[PDB]
Write a protein that binds this ligand. Structure first.
Ligand SMILES: N[C@@H](CCC(=O)O)C(=O)O
Ligand SMILES: N[C@@H](CCC(=O)O)C(=O)O
Lengths: 257, 257
């Protein structure tokens, strides 16, 4: 039985209603739950969903050199596959493998409706509206590593902001936007942004274009015999239109706005 | 010296003005010429651009089973890398390797301006306006393999249309749209469509959403020592913003409409 690391992140992996009465995999639902079932069926594996203990995507500590999050679970042999909105990045590709993308996305801006912001440049040239991002993820790294003036300016502000503008979870970031009367904006992936825009109370909005262009991949540890089967499975699911059906199912068919 | 297979396709690879006075690689310009230069610089190779002799992207003949086009050049060892708008597909992944995507795209519809068509459904529901696609590529295979009702209907029409609606080159398809007074539409990748929309005589238009979501990758033959270096170089260029800069350079900075 293959251990699948994943993360509680709507609408990828969520608790069922009355999840406490279900056992194992049956506790959970969502895009990545369905994707896990689809891949497992295609490659012929039994699997067990294990929610990442630390609740993180995956970053490397500069001192200890230790990987945390889902990336860590793969690197240290605690999971055999990651099926999650895990961004394909250079630093991760050096330690784990990724399938070709199952979803395409870019970093984006979430505002409380009515906030006078439509671009990164708009955020960077002002201080009346605070902004932040998820901790320990690819978005934070994007800003830390950027050599583009506008993003450098945003990083310089965010890294020194007090109280901290980096959140433990996406939901925390969203909640912060919603309660801050337009005075906090959140930098997050277009996928999560567009999902939240269709959820009650319908008070948030994606503004401007995406900051970058990238993808999520299904990840495996180096040397895994699952690498090629997984890659081919993702491509088959893409070409068969199943990935499109799954996105429509979890984003738009269930839309509330 | 690494042999780089590529294809004459605007704005990826084009002849310089007065190409005839230049030698070797310096005869060419375009997005993929710049990409090859960037990749070679990162991985430390010398290279020679070789335009694919048959002028095809690459398909497997059902009878003889032989790969043609750029895919063929790699499979039979006539080239060491493909740097071109080559779509990452399942059937190709079975015979060659691809980097993670350097460009994201989907199939789209090109019309002559004023054509009463806004969607694939619009095309499938009528017979007055003919429509087709490129030979030996991923768009043709998309329609052949689709089980989506609308696309099945389009395939059934296109495969048996007289005169032929399939073209040998993208340029042929585009010329046919421009010359056919609204009575021909062309199915091609969003990237090519968007480029053409910004070129004189500014008489074409992309209509409707993309039919799928996929990527172009830099391709290498199985067992190539260049596989990993190429993959990391593409991700490095992505993360540094170079891919975005090159798209802007070749699509929009050079817009004519
Ligand atoms: N998908 C991101 C997490 C979300 C974010 O950083 O915006 C990652 O893999 O790290
Ligand atoms: N990029 C496609 C060719 C263009 C098309 O098929 O529309 C391929 O690699 O086959």
């Amino acid at each position: 039985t293959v251990v699948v690391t994943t993360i509680m992140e709507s609408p990828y992996v969520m608790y069922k209603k009355n999840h406490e009465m279900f056992e194992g995999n049956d506790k959970y639902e969502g895009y990545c739950v369905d994707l896990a079932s689809e891949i497992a069926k295609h490659i012929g594996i039994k699997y067990k969903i294990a929610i990442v203990p630390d609740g993180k995507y995956g970053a490397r500590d500069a001192d200890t050199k230790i990987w945390n999050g889902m990336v860590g679970e793969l690197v240290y042999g605690k999971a055999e596959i990651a099926i999650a909105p895990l961004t394909i990045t250079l630093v991760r590709e050096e330690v784990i493998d990724f399938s070709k993308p199952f979803m395409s996305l870019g970093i984006s801006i979430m505002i409380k409706k009515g906030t006078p912001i439509e671009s990164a440049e708009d955020l960077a040239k002002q201080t009346e509206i605070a902004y932040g991002t998820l901790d320990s993820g690819s978005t934070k790294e994007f800003f830390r590593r950027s050599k583009i003036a506008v993003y450098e300016k945003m990083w310089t502000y965010m890294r020194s902001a007090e109280p901290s503008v980096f959140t433990r979870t996406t939901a925390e970031g969203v909640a912060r936007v919603r309660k801050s009367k337009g005075k906090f904006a959140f930098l997050l992936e277009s996928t999560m942004n567009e999902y939240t825009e269709q959820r009650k109370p319908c008070d948030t909005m994606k503004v401007g274009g995406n900051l970058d262009s990238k993808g999520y991949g299904v990840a495996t540890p180096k040397g895994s015999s699952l690498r090629t089967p997984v890659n081919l499975a993702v491509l088959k699911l893409s070409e068969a239109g199943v990935l499109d059906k799954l996105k429509n199912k979890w984003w738009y068919d269930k839309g509330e706005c």
